Structure 1
Amino acid sequence: FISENVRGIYAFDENGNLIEKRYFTDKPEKVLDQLLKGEITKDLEELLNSLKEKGYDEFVFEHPELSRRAKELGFSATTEFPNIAGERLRSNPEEFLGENWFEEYYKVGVALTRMRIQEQSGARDKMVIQAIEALDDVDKVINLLVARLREWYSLHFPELDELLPKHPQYVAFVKTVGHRDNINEEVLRELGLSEEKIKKILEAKEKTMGAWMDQTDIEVVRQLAEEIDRLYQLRKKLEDYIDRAMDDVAPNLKALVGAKLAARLISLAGGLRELAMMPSSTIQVLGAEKALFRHLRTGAKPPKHGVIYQYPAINRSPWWQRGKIARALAGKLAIAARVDYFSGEYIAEELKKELEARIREIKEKY
């Protein structure tokens, strides 16, 4: 009844004609992975509710678990993979996407293969900063090797230097030409030069004042141009890395302790400003409640720990370790709360490593 592909979502009847079609409201790989692995997304949800407004009460999908979620959503849903909606779209894609269809299938297939692995840094913005310094350093060494490439190739074709000002167009010219008699109207028009620019170059090749480099020499200058086109491809891999890396952003307290303790410390300080304004030797005892109250009013036993008690090394360990870990944890938390309020920048894998190290030190001690 319903089926999905690279560009959209389609409903066909039990005789075999189209009822309705949708396209995705987010980037296609990001929505299609959910629909491929078996879970529901808003664009398929709006289509199947359009079929419910149009008076269809029974539904047939392709994936067994998307069908399982569809009945849990309140629908008479079942699974039959050979059904007409998918059978038509996958048999005659040129009827729906036209005679170029495989190019859009390609563009999302490679992107899904780039997405079906997890991405989690401890230093993502610092890695982006080193990629930004690499982008100026790469452009700066491209400029250096291009200055040598201009001067050395000017021994063999000196008229070229003023004639091709655009640096990557000079690099790709020397990469593919090598020796000056491989210059033809065809290869210059494949390299995408204008008929005007091709009215020169060829005029100069018939009259050049340059010297002679042998076949054995001029391939070294061709290899210099090929390694500069390697550097220009690395330049794009740096730009495309940053274009992904700016999606992995997060708060620190969620990683160092997680919501059960993070939202408790925020609520017992009344707010996240107030938690960031607190000392470790009060963050230790936030949510000690009746124990903090009577340590004041009746001068009772000082509270050893508050709501931090259910931490992964307190409610489950010997008394010797329970007191020492409580204040060390509250120290590292007083750093983490100030980071998440005043700057919002991510360092929490190092705050974890230091709390691994101090608890390993508590282990070699006790």
Structure 2
Amino acid sequence: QSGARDKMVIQAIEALDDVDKVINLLVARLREWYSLHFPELDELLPKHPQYVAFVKTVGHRDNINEEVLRELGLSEEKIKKILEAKEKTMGAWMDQTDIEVVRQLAEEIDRLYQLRKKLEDYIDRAMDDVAPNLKALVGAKLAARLISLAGGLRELAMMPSSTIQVLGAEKALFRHLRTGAKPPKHGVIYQYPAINRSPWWQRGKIARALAGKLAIAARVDYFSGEYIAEELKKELEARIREIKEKY
């Protein structure tokens, strides 16, 4: 049992979100900065992982040609058009010293994407030793945010379903609770596919159903280690299609 493993899982999911923040931050800098040398590449490569991968392995404009752009694995339209904008760009010239420091920034953002993947692998595997039922229902990541929002597995296992349904809506909840404003129907559980994409008019009842099952899965994970997730998912599948039915 141990019993601190849920705390480390929490740390890791929070870590994942923290890592996400810095990637978004460094990438932005990377784009603003390499744009002094090559302004157009920005709109061409809206996908960060691709933009960072470019700067890192290509660098200065002089190094591009047809060759290196395929080994980068970008499509054929994308290549000739970036290849075109180059030979023709209005960007400032960079020295070898100048481009090297921005290539070092890219190299680091790449290390980070790998770190991000490492964390996401850890959470996914650790989640099988911590709350298998939660994983089965909502996915590894979502179950971690739930544990995380509640403060731990035990703290989750103690909550009424109605608290679970609103975890991660804390602002909305406390607003309602004070001024009698209309309550949130969902917190983080909105991510759950069946909720996030469904007629807006059945989203509330699905959240209510899912939270009920999440409460039972959490109590079992914590107090037994018994595996009921299959019944649970099926009984949930049942109740959703039944909701889907009449509306």
Q: CA RMSD in A?
A: 20.6
Residues 188, 198 of structure 1: 8 Å contact kept: yes
Q: What's the counterpart of residue 307 of structure 1?
A: 188
| CA spacing shift, 1:279–1:240, aligned 2, 3 Å | closer
Alpha-carbon distance, 1:265 to partner? 32
> Unpaired runs of 5+ in structure 2?
none
TM-score, structure 1 as length reference = 0.37
Cα distance in 2 between the residues matched to 1:310 and 1:164? 27
Residues 122, 347 of structure 1: 8 Å contact kept: no
> Unpaired runs of 5+ in structure 1?
1-119
Residues 183, 202 of structure 1: 8 Å contact kept: yes
Please list the CA deviations of residues 284-343 of structure 1 after superposition, one character each: whole Å capped at 9, or x if unmatched. 999999999999999999999999999999999999999999999999999999999879
| CA spacing shift, 1:240–1:281, aligned 2, 3 Å | closer
Residues 150, 156 of structure 2: 8 Å contact kept: yes
Residues 249, 346 of structure 1: 8 Å contact kept: no
| CA spacing shift, 1:350–1:227, aligned 2, 3 Å | farther
TM-score, structure 2 as length reference = 0.53
**Identity level (%):** 100
| CA spacing shift, 1:328–1:239, aligned 2, 3 Å | closer
Which of 246-255 and 356-365 deviates more? 356-365
Please list the CA deviations of residues 256-294 of structure 1 after superposition, one character each: whole Å capped at 9, or x if unmatched. 999999999999999999999999999999999999999
Residues 277, 338 of structure 1: 8 Å contact kept: yes
Alpha-carbon distance, 1:186 to partner? 2.2
Cα distance in 1 between the residues matched to 2:84 and 2:223? 65
Alpha-carbon distance, 1:249 to partner? 3.5
Alpha-carbon distance, 1:188 to partner? 1.4
Cα distance in 2 between the residues matched to 1:240 and 1:161? 31
Cα distance in 1 between the residues matched to 2:39 and 2:181? 92
Q: What's the counterpart of residue 215 of structure 1?
A: 96
Q: What's the counterpart of residue 298 of structure 1?
A: 179
Alpha-carbon distance, 1:247 to partner? 2.4
| CA spacing shift, 1:240–1:301, aligned 2, 3 Å | closer
Residues 157, 208 of structure 1: 8 Å contact kept: yes
| CA spacing shift, 1:329–1:160, aligned 2, 3 Å | closer
Residues 124, 141 of structure 2: 8 Å contact kept: no
Please list the CA deviations of residues 111-142 of structure 1 after superposition, one character each: whole Å capped at 9, or x if unmatched. xxxxxxxxx75322221111111111111110
Q: Matched residue of 2:111: which SS?
A: helix
| CA spacing shift, 1:142–1:363, aligned 2, 3 Å | closer
| CA spacing shift, 1:156–1:313, aligned 2, 3 Å | closer
| CA spacing shift, 1:183–1:252, aligned 2, 3 Å | closer
Please list the CA deviations of residues 12-39 of structure 1 after superposition, one character each: whole Å capped at 9, or x if unmatched. xxxxxxxxxxxxxxxxxxxxxxxxxxxx
Q: Matched residue of 2:166: which SS?
A: coil
